[PDB]
Amino acid sequence: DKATIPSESPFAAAEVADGAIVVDIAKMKYETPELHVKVGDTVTWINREAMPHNVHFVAGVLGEAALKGPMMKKEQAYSLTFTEAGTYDYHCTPHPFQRGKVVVE
Numbered sequence: 001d002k003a004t005i006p007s008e009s010p011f012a013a014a015e016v017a018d019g020a021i022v023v024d025i026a027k028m029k030y031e032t033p034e035l036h037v038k039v040g041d042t043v044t045w046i047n048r049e050a051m052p053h054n055v056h057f058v059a060g061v062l063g064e065a066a067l068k069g070p071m072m073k074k075e076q077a078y079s080l081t082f083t084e085a086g087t088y089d090y091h092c093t094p095h096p097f098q099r100g101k102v103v104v105e
């Protein structure tokens with residue numbers, strides 16, 4: 001795999017980690033749709049709105065299987081720690097028009 005998952009379920013925005021690289025989900029978009037990080041960094045998405053959102057990477061992107069993240073309710077968060085360089089496209093499962101990528105260097 002190309003990422004590890006600190007928590008399989010979402011958690012409160014209040015508990016996002018120090019050194020957290022945060023992508024807000026607001027106005028029905030990933031507010032940083034193209035994010036550049038380093039190997040070993042943890043990215044945390046935080047849903048700011050009432051509509052649920054997730055992050056979903058199809059099979060072959062973060063690993064052999066698709067990574068369909070859990071649905072984040074308002075003011076919840078979800079993290080991925082990227083362990084290998086690459087370009088990792090994702091979308092929101094319920095809203096496939098909502099797309100982003102993480103580029104890991």
Ligand SMILES: [Cu+]
Nearest residue numbers: 053092095098
């Ligand atoms: Cu969404």
